[PDB]
Amino acid sequence: SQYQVGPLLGSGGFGSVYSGIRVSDNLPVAIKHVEKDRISDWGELPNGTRVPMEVVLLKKVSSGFSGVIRLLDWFERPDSFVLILERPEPVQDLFDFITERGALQEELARSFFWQVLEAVRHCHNCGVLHRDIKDENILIDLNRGELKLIDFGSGALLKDTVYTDFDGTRVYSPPEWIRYHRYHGRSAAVWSLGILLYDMVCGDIPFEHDEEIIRGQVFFRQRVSSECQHLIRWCLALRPSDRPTFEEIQNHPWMQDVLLPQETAEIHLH
């Protein structure tokens, strides 16, 4: 009615995502159907309405501009919720991008990683923990060179105490989760960021099995500068408290002289 539904973009047990167009202005959107009986975590709006937590989280971060995909609207159905999400065009997710082009040049990896950090910082500042940071949940606006974080379906309100639930991606999950089913938000995020950064510069993730994660030894399969290797190994410290803060990551020498998004697009995407 209010949207022209296009092709399916992806699906899972959570539900399904379609490309779409808002009739009123031809604005590109994504349409996410979320099955009610597969929602683990429910939240509340002021009005008291139960909604998926993702709706709560998205509202907390969809204020203003950011590298987070914005929730434009949402609807309730008898057995599902429907989320209307911002859709840049043309886009490609980071997983497909790395698949097509292999390991990224460090200058490009630096630009992308920096934008992800800024997006994650925005989330934390808004009281939101994403909990599933990975290449598939990152969209690249190919024209503007801007990255967007998506899928807060595994996320949670940020807190300073321990989390005992996790339904994000295992190979991006920290050793303390694998072992003790316990983690703290920021340090677990930093671990996933380490996995992400390795993924960008090596063209694949560093760990496949639980035992490799808890061993935490990083082998580099591509030529990577010593500074980048150092940042990666720091983010992947076995002890959570040994991991850097976001500020320490962004002040790391490897992170200096980041390209602007449009510069990034001009050199690397055009």
Ligand X SMILES: COc1ccc2c(c1CN1CCNCC1)O/C(=C\c1c[nH]c3cnccc13)C2=O
Task: Please tell me whether residue 9 binds ligand X under the rule CB under 6 A.
Answer: yes
As beta bridge partners, residue 30 has 19, 85
DSSP letters, 202-231, are HSS-S--SHHHHHH-PPPPSS---HHHHHH
Residue whose beta carbon is closest to ligand X: 10
Task: Please tell me whether residue 253 binds ligand X under the rule CB under 6 A.
Answer: no
Task: Please tell me whether residue 127 binds ligand X under the rule CB under 6 A.
Answer: no
Q: Count interface residues toward ligand X (CB under 6 A).
A: 18
Shortest distance (Å) from residue 21 CB to ligand X: 12
Other beta carbons less than 10 A from residue 153's beta carbon? 26
Task: Please tell me whether residue 17 binds ligand X under the rule CB under 6 A.
Answer: yes
Tokens in use for 193?
A: 């960021």
Q: Indicate the annotated binding residues for ATP.
A: 9-17, 32, 86, 93
Residues ≥6 apart with Cβ < 8 Å to 131: 154, 155, 156, 166, 167, 168, 188, 189
Shortest distance (Å) from residue 188 CB to ligand X: 20
| Candidate list 118, 141, 151, 176; residue touching ligand X; CB under 6 A | 151
Stretch that binds ligand X, among 108-116, 149-157, 167-175, 199-207 (CB under 6 A): 149-157
Enzyme catalytic residues: 132
Task: Please tell me whether residue 87 binds ligand X under the rule CB under 6 A.
Answer: yes
Residues ≥6 apart with Cβ < 8 Å to 233: 194, 218
Task: Please tell me whether residue 199 binds ligand X under the rule CB under 6 A.
Answer: no
Task: Please tell me whether residue 136 binds ligand X under the rule CB under 6 A.
Answer: yes
Largest CA-CA distance found in the chain, in angstroms, rounded = 55
